[PDB]
A paper describes a structure:
Rubisco in β-carboxysomes represents a plant-like, form 1B Rubisco and is a hexadecameric complex composed of eight large subunits (RbcL, 50 to 55 kDa) and eight small subunits (RbcS, 12 to 18 kDa), denoted as RbcL8S8 (3). RbcL subunits are arranged as a tetramer of antiparallel RbcL dimers to form RbcL8 as the main catalytic core, along with eight RbcS subunits that dock at the top and bottom to stabilize RbcL8 and tune Rubisco activity. The folding of newly-synthesized RbcL requires the chaperonin proteins, GroEL and GroES, and the subsequent assembly of folded RbcL monomers into oligomers is triggered by binding with the chaperones Rubisco assembly factor 1 (Raf1) and RbcX. Reconstruction and cryo-electron microscopy (cryo-EM) of the Syn7942 RbcL-Raf1 complex demonstrate that Raf1 is critical for assembly of Rubisco holoenzymes by mediating the formation of RbcL dimer and RbcL dimer–dimer interactions.
Numbering used by the authors:
A (entry chain L): 13 to 191
B (entry chain A), C (entry chain H), D (entry chain E), E (entry chain D): 19 to 465
């Protein structure tokens, strides 16, 4: 079924999707994981890295990314989208648009994706709050920053602790702290 | 005895351990806290002839806090602090000996439970660490997308050399990743430790020859003497077995640290069975928590660790179990009381231990499992009454099909806690073994 | 699950262990007993493909009791039974792993406490035993009429080479038989393990040269690795120290059995410091009893054993301790529930372990101390606030005078538990140090 | 290349090293600083194919500062930062290999000098440390109030087995504390290493027999092969010599640390003679500083280490030496640019190394010496033309008399930098050897 | 001090070393030369009591020259000598310790640079030599007509076991002869030290299975202690790797001589990385020259040696490198000042070390490379920005193709310094990878 479709893999031609579309279709030839990299040139660790955000891109065709979140997102967020594998269809594009409007060092959303995973588990959302990474982070300090007692380990969440400009509730609840 | 809460500005190294504390009545609370602080080191200001000359004030284990338990009668959390120099490099035994060796049961309080421990960056770095990382273990095993598979060989006993090893070959050729001995198949005179190792070894080798996947069995080396332990380990390396299993708490930390340093020396993966744990960690008012053993056993290194599962447990207990699952894969962890992590602990690139759950779980629990442990874990089977009425190798094949379909359907993005039963139903449409697995149990516990 | 009370005539070998048992309500009692019996071996009749073919009925751990506790709500001891072949020769670790490794906390009962253990004659004989007998230890030490003397060097820390060495010399010379270093005085970077051994060794050496009595110090060899342990032990034999001390429960039974076999191999006496023995044995509904550790630690041999004392304790507790205290020196022991010995146990000439008591005891309890432990024991001092203003060596001299007068006045036949105070008081008539000891405390507790 | 000064908030572990930096003209300054930062790790962001898939941003050695030198043309101090994971536990060799292995001479700048290095508390605790502390060395030597004494045996060569050992006998009999040979003395075919060790050993033993003070002379073990080195060093251990001397920089840290680990594994002192430390630290624009080297030596684990003296040197240079002199006795040191401490450094109870000064110093320099090094040091003699025209034994005796009488001046309270000449004048009134020492030189350099 | 120029008739053994010498003003020139001669051995005629009985005149290090530098202010090379007996057999450490250990920075002269060294025939035939010759290395590798190929892996970190193992496959398979990791790669927390070896080893073995050429990787064994070093190096031989790499100057000559004697003992080739060289050899007035390290490192044997390259430096400096480049291959070398050879040196059939150049040179310098090092060398790649935009294995093939064609061109007789660009242009006419190599750079630096 495949003639000369590995030469583009061999020559390293294509941005990033011409790698992943190719490897996923090619994986149903008969060769195992230790055969496609035993020639073309693809480490197993990375062979799986782009062997999922393939399917995360299949997952994020819920909303259309409005031509400002797909320009340089054609072959980027490799480990960024690789690590998110426990998100809710309703947040996979919502966490990615945060990662492309925040511009931090490539692996930083592994920690928000755990507290977000915990946020979409409690039988019922908290009232005057919504399900989002911006709110989860803001509500993450409630069971952390608030739990804290000292100004040394309680004033470090004045920027990363909140920054949920997507929920007034958290902003209205983060007012009695200027004490 | 004035160490009650002098606010201390608790510091970088500091060994900040905590305690679930319950006095006997007729005892004021912070005096008993400073009693803990004095009993931890240099008891109760023991009067010497030099106390008028020199002040012993460099090594005081020093309490600084008191806070009553939310929703409890006569109990509070005391935060202890021990500066640096009370501990040896290399030892977890010295850690436990210094902290809790005599402090419990000092006939003033009713009960006491060592709940948590903070390990500093300047003590974490001087230990051995695990023999291999999660990364390095996946590197040696080429298992890159899914959790690892395992079952326990049944029955326990009366199932001798050819019996046991060729049952291992059948149950492993069915498609699993690992098989283990249980805790008590040491060198017992119906089944000598020699030939079990030989036959299990040959079974692994022929199974690697057929299936083309790297395979392994958890060999038990729980030994009476340390020389017996090193001898059985050296035979395990002589025939090239990738992993050995060794219980930690009954064998002891000196044997375990020695065996871990050996596994670093020869490059063999290391499994730990948490036998005899329920003696110490069950009651909610007296003992130590399994979390403290989990951090200490990440230090005295191991590559695997039984941790148990969450099936129908209480919500806060499930959150606590997730808490100390998170204490051994992440290397920078914040502090949640409701998950039971009282301290913000760094690990300074120690490549933490894989957890592995083993309870009475069949395949319908599998869509919960990949929902809970994510990807970085090993999953067990074969505990209770789950004898496959077709066979053990068909059971292993059905297990492999089940986990492959579950990992791929989690990759599908279908919220697999909700639809995992239907996932397995469409998965068994061509595999008759998985159809039998559908037939033998059910999943209508809850949504 | 039909292993309730089938009598079956409990037999010679049989490993007849017992349990203090407390269910959660909604549980019938003997079904939970057979649940203990099934969880001890081959859990809950796990269904296999050979069941219909072969009956697994040679290694079942059937119980034979259900007796409610006299004076307790929901509490009745259950006598189990495990035949022979579930246990390895040489190991106490396999004993604990087989009996209580997973049985506790199986989420059906409220609580469970391993209370007692019967060891058969055909398993007792295959272990190492202690390195030396009470007989043999007296033979090596020439201490033939009195209990042995000991104090703890105070303070705990900040008391380095010379400071720790010179202090030991005075305390030892004063007239004691032994001294023991701080439990957590392992190789900590303010006090390296090298020079403490060198100075204590020289200290003891010089002491003997002067006093003409065989002397010794309890050297601590609690080590991280087993190779560190063997290295420190080999240095302890290189300079000729008669005894080493080593805590058992945090270091672990594999290290302890190895070290005991080493002490047999080189002929050195062996002390064991019960460290963290309350984190398991304190609560009266959950854990194991210290008695079971005492029998297991007589097996994985040791020549001494901290056992604590009876000063103002409860009557049944005092008797309980005595019960287990006489369940080691004797080699043929009957069964008393009120002393806590549930089984009639033989030892087949194992020369059992000396006990040694260490609590907050001054000389006033000297008459009572001997009155309790008779002659075959070691007695400690220096725990709490008993700093002798005159001096540590005057304190040791007063101690020696006190014990000599107490042993001789017990030989006088006058009630030592009635005329104790008078004896000591009258004795101090020429020794001013003992007169200061009379001055510093009192014994008007009772008759 | 954007790492210029992004302010970084420099952190706890961070390995904050500094540099004396001088570009070639036509080079902008912070680009060359980020060139240092890139050359320290992952050079100039080496183009790769995984750079468009993964950002390599966890291990960047990251510069953050620029500050021009006060009173210098075309030079500034750059503060580098390397986070944690670029360094192995146990190695100083990996430290030097990572920091300065290729960074110097990269053909863009004129010159570069590694000036300082701040070790973290989570990396300096994982090293061995010295074999013995200043405390522990005084404990083994019973020298409690005064600095230690030493002379070099003269001449260097042609002074064979009976000559050398018996020559040290007189010197050691005189009253000195130590007597070490010069670097060039290893196993050279006019003087085989065997018999020098034997005769020096016998001289030490007979001198201890006569004088009653613990004695010991440095025994160079600088060896070609590690096996040979250990072999010759082993002899000393068997002959019970308390200390061995071994040069560090020509023999190598690899062979040094290994020997240092064996030094604390047998309990023997350690003498590190800084040989070849002028052709790597002399020029003020290119090299590494002795201070940095000194820190590394402390990490290795040496007891003594030649640190030279201040006799008529420049004020800032004298202070500089003093600044680094304390950088190895104190364990918590602040930061002075004029002294040397560029960044505050903790040591976490590493018991730092004794310094020892060896220059062309006679006894009139002795009232400066105890003025400078206080009490915690060793003092040398015998460098230049100071052949005592009476004799070596008398000369040594005179030296001891001087220091002994001097140390009294320090305790007296006479400001001994001012009156030390008159102190020696009243000291020589009964000792004729010290009177000859008064005769042979003078002290009127300055007040 | 009379050793100025007494013409000496400089002899056969004589250790005739030289010096680049620069006084401070106010110093007469030959007195400072005799000061060097006295400081080298038995300093400044140190007085003694046997100076009027025996004349110390057998071991003096008198000089025999004082010629001013052609084209320099205050700079004249001195020719000091040292007869035989100041040096141990087997040691380079003793050589450096005797010659330059304290001579530099003796506060009389401004600066001093150890420029050259003559090794006698009765002292250069008593050292181990290299483990294998150039001949013997070609014998073990079957590489008979061309220089060997090698490209350092990139990135420098974050590129772990399987990722750093599979990446070596392409680089090696593509067609190279060797690959080598950088100094900073030793045992780190982000990448074990044994794991990497295993993966790397396997890559080599499978690549030998496919290509049919003997292949190898330069494994780094820079270790903290000696035991660890030997231990890690021992594993390499067990796995069967043909060569190990080990930096010399930071690890130290004792470790290096021991490792070289080990490589003779097991027959493994030996690579040396010249890390930390630029600290010592860069400035033209102070230090030692890399040439002296090159001769000393030919003695303390090694089979390879990084030596750099003459890409486009000054002609005067270019020749200098060549001068020291022929101080290993040849075994009978004349003396050129404009080349480095200050005195003719024999080697008595020591089979000298292969050089290897590693700079920012791509395939454009390949034609020139063959022009300089002839045939007996190894050539490196991958330093700066030369990431092949096709791939590393296409780059490897291109590299081999280039050198291969280049070698042929040189063999043809076309004066390849002139036409080498056109040679590569006709070479890339069928290889597209070499055409990309033509595309990415250029050669129009000069004719």
């Amino acid at each position: 079924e495949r003639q000369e479709l590995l030469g583009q893999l061999r020559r390293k031609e294509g941005r990033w999707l011409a790698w992943a579309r190719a490897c996923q279709t090619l994986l149903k030839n008969g060769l195992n994981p230790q055969t496609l990299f035993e020639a073309t040139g693809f480490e197993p660790i990375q062979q799986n890295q782009i062997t999922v955000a393939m399917q995360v891109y299949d997952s994020i065709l819920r909303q259309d990314p409005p031509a400002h979140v797909r320009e340089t997102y054609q072959e980027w967020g490799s480990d960024l989208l690789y690590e998110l594998r426990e998100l809710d269809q309703e947040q996979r594009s919502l966490c990615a648009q945060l990662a492309l409007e925040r511009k931090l060092d490539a692996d930083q959303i592994r920690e928000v994706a755990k507290a977000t995973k915990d946020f979409c588990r409690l039988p019922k959302q908290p009232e005057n709050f919504d399900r989002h990474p911006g709110d989860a982070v803001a509500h993450q300090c409630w069971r952390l920053a608030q739990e804290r007692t000292d100004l040394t380990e309680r004033s470090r969440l004045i920027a990363r602790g909140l920054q949920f400009a997507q929920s007034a509730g958290a902003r209205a609840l983060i007012e009695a702290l200027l004490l | 005895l004035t160490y009650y809460t002098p606010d201390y500005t608790p510091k970088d190294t500091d060994l900040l351990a905590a305690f679930r504390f319950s006095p006997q009545p007729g005892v004021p609370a912070p005096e008993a806290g400073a009693a803990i602080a004095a009993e931890s080191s240099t008891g109760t200001w023991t009067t010497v002839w030099t106390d008028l000359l020199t002040d012993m004030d460099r090594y005081d284990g020093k309490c600084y806090h008191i806070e009553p338990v939310q929703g409890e009668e006569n109990s509070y959390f005391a935060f202890i602090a021990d500066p640096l120099d009370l501990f040896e490099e290399g030892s977890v035994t010295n850690i436990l000996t210094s902290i809790v060796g005599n402090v419990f049961g000092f006939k003033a309080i009713r009960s006491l439970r060592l709940e948590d421990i903070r390990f500093p960056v300047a003590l974490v770095k001087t230990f051995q660490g695990p023999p291999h990382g999660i990364q390095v273990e996946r590197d040696l095993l080429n298992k890159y997308g899914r959790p690892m598979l395992g079952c326990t060989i049944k029955p326990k006993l009366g199932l001798s050399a050819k019996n046991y090893g060729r049952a291992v070959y059948e149950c492993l050729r069915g498609g699993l990743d690992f098989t283990k001995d249980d805790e008590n198949i040491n060198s017992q005179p119906f089944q000598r430790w020699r030939d079990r190792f030989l036959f299990v070894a040959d079974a692994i080798h022929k199974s690697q020859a057929e299936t083309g996947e790297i395979k392994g069995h958890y060999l038990n080396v729980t030994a009476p003497t340390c020389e017996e332990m090193m001898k059985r380990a050296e035979f395990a390396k002589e025939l090239g077995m990738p992993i050995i299993m060794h219980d930690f708490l009954t064998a002891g930390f000196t044997a375990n640290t020695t065996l871990a340093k050996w596994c670093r020396d020869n490059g063999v993966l290391l499994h730990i069975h948490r036998a005899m744990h329920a003696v110490i960690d069950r009651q909610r008012n007296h003992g130590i928590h399994f979390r403290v053993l989990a951090k200490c056993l990440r230090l005295s290194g191991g590559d695997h660790l039984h941790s148990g599962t969450v099936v129908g447990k209480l919500e806060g207990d499930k959150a606590s179990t997730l808490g100390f699952v998170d204490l051994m894969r992440e290397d920078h962890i914040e502090a949640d009381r409701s998950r039971g992590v009282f301290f913000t602990q760094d690990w300074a690139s120690m490549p933490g231990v894989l957890p592995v759950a083993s309870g009475g779980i069949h395949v319908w629990h599998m869509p919960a499992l990949v929902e809970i442990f994510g990807d970085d874990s090993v999953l067990q089977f074969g505990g209770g009454t789950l004898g496959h009425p077709w066979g053990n190798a068909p059971g292993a094949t059905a297990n492999r099909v089940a986990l492959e379909a579950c990992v791929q359907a989690r990759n599908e993005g279908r919220d697999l806690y909700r639809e995992g039963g239907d996932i397995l139903r469409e998965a068994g449409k061509w595999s008759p073994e998985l159809a039998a697995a559908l037939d033998l149990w059910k999943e209508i516990k809850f949504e």
